[PDB]
């Protein structure tokens, strides 16, 4: 059944709760972002109001064929009334169109649901600074101190320099980047930009990217693989067998592949810097795993929470085991005692 951490008390609202059938009592279904664990269950047959960002609304219409009459897009940073309750959507710094939701309950309680986010000090100057938040429904994906990772900017610098050097040394090398969802577009766009190429991709992925309101996107992406030297493939195909096969398909236009797998965290993060990453190589194929995260590090999450000072924290990730739940609750207490709230 629908878990309590997907229900907003004092409202008829749920968040990211589309795979339980009809949630009894639910008058409005919010969707924080277009990732499959969150939208699982939506389709053209859904007949309840869905509230979301503009970009998530484009993807619901165009990729899932949800009917327009049930899609209710809200602008960001704007006080809106939904079934008599004031709400605000904020940028979550996750994938395109991903939002956090501020609920102002009729009784005076204020609730923030982060959806999926990567906490950032810029959030300390949004509409969150303007009033107290009593309850926080928190993206705890990486809520443990082993999870460090570099800034997004450092990771893109590494990828740009690596690609540029490889292709300038060998003009017959192909760059491949893996993907299995929206997000992490900066990886492949920034590489294609330094190389003066467009990124080539399948028709289905091209359609997905045209839903994202990215400025000048017609200038950066294409479905013509032949004119492109940065290809996007399913993440499943980013391995030596899948890459050798793809190389055959290019007809001897290329003799070398340099591939990027933008992973979340991998245990080389506890030992190795970004400056010191190396690929896996077999023959003329090299694969780089790069730690490009769209979730908070442990320290970024801790700062955000110690700044916000909520009265109650409700984790939405890693909640399935007692040992995980109990460990997170221990960090939350440390944070509160260190900061004095
Ligand atoms: Ni997500």
Curated annotation (Swiss-Prot):
Species annotation: Homo sapiens
Phenotype for residue 295 to A: Impaired nuclear focus formation, reduced interaction with PIAS and increased sensitivity to cisplatin
Tissue-specific expression: Expressed in brain, heart, kidney, liver, pancreas, placenta and skeletal muscle.
Induction: During mitosis. The mRNA encoding this protein contains an internal ribosome entry site (IRES) in its 5'-UTR. This 5'-UTR generally suppresses translation while specifically promoting expression during mitosis, when cap-dependent translation may be impaired.
Full protein name: DNA cross-link repair 1A protein
Effect of residue 139 to N: Impaired nuclear focus formation, reduced interaction with PIAS and increased sensitivity to cisplatin
Cited function: May be required for DNA interstrand cross-link repair. Also required for checkpoint mediated cell cycle arrest in early prophase in response to mitotic spindle poisons. Possesses beta-lactamase activity, catalyzing the hydrolysis of penicillin G and nitrocefin. Exhibits no activity towards other beta-lactam antibiotic classes including cephalosporins (cefotaxime) and carbapenems (imipenem).
Subunit structure: Binds constitutively to TP53BP1. Binds CDC27, which is itself a component of the anaphase promoting complex (APC). Binds PIAS1.
Family: Belongs to the DNA repair metallo-beta-lactamase (DRMBL) family.
Entry's localization field: Nucleus
Top-rank taxon: Eukaryota
């Amino acid at each position: 059944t629908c878990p309590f951490y997907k229900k907003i008390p004092g409202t008829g609202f749920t968040v990211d709760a589309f795979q339980y059938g009809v949630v009894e009592g639910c008058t409005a279904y919010f969707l924080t972002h277009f990732h499959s664990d969150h939208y699982a269950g939506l389709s053209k047959h859904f007949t309840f109001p869905v509230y979301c960002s503009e970009i998530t609304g484009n993807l619901l219409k165009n990729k899932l064929h949800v009917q327009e009459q049930y899609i209710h897009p809200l602008p960001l940073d704007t006080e809106c009334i939904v079934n008599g309750v004031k709400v605000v959507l904020l940028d979550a710094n996750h994938c395109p169109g991903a939002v956090m939701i501020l609920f102002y309950l009729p009784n005076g309680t204020v609730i923030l649901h982060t959806g999926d986010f990567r906490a950032d000090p810029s959030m300390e100057r949004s509409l969150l600074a303007d009033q107290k938040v009593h309850m926080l429904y928190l993206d705890t994906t990486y809520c443990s101190p082993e999870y460090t990772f570099p800034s997004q900017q450092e990771v893109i610098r590494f990828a740009i320099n690596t690609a540029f050097e490889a292709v300038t040394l060998n003009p017959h090398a192909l760059v491949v980047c893996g993907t299995y969802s929206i997000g992490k577009e900066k990886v492949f766009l920034a590489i294609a930009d330094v190389l003066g190429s467009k990124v080539g991709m399948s028709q289905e992925k091209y359609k997905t990217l045209q839903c994202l309101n990215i400025p000048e996107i017609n200038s950066l992406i294409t479905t013509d693989m032949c004119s492109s030297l940065v290809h996007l493939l399913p993440m499943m195909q980013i391995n030596f067998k899948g890459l050798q096969s793809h190389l055959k398909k290019c007809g001897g236009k290329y003799n070398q592949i340099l591939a990027f797998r933008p992973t979340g965290w991998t245990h080389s993060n506890k030992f190795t810097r970004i400056a010191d990453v190396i690929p896996q190589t077999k023959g003329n194929i090299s694969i780089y795993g790069i730690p490009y995260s769209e979730h908070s590090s442990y320290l970024e999450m801790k700062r955000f929470v110690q700044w916000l000072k909520p009265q109650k924290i409700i984790p939405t990730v890693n909640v399935g085991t007692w040992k995980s739940r109990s460990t997170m609750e221990k960090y939350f207490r440390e944070w509160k005692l260190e900061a004095g709230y």
